[PDB]
Amino acid sequence: VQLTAAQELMIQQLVAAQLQCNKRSFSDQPKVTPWPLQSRDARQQRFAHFTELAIISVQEIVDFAKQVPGFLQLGREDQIALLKASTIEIMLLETARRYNHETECITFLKDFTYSKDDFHRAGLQVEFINPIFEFSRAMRRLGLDDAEYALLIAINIFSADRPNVQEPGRVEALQQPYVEALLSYTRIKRPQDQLRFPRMLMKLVSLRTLSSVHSEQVFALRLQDKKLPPLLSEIWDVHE
């Protein structure tokens, strides 16, 4: 088979919207605390560096889900439920896509790169850091491109089982068109390797575990004097 004129147009839609939202959030060397280069002003700045950058990421994510056909048709409640659970997973998807194997560094922007030790320095736990870098290598092992990532992130946003969804059955209906697009896409990309599509979905399995680990990272974060700025704290902090 082949891509339907519709699907193709949709896949182009997503890849383009993903490009524009990125430009609209990171085309400006962010106004965030600069990475130092020791003391408690870098250990508290480095952490601010990541935290402040993550915020922008949340804004890009929200901005891009608004472009995913079907997303705006749900209710604001469900938009929050969905977005509030996929932010950390979507972030790790992006972190993965932006991973360099030869240098083992994740480069967020141009002249904005970080090593594993940068993450440690930044305040994060080895418990969290290793799993994300391990996930990043697993991701490159699949050799995903821009269409597949866009598609995998869409599929991710529409997870019916996310906590507090009002219209799961509806969220689920919204997902399927994208799964298909990926199924048909992968069939074209490596017809001689049918199990490559399931290896992909499999990454969704790991993004949940990562999401749990990250929560234990939040939990432990708020055991130190490290507090998450308001926006992050909303989506991640446990508060009445």
Binding site: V58, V62, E77, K84, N164, L231, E234
Partner: peptide
């Protein structure tokens, strides 16, 4: 409920 508990997030969804 999920809009009040998440004010800033709610705001991002409406600035569009």
């Amino acid at each position: 409920s999920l809009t009040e508990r998440h004010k800033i997030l709610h705001r991002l969804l409406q600035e569009g």
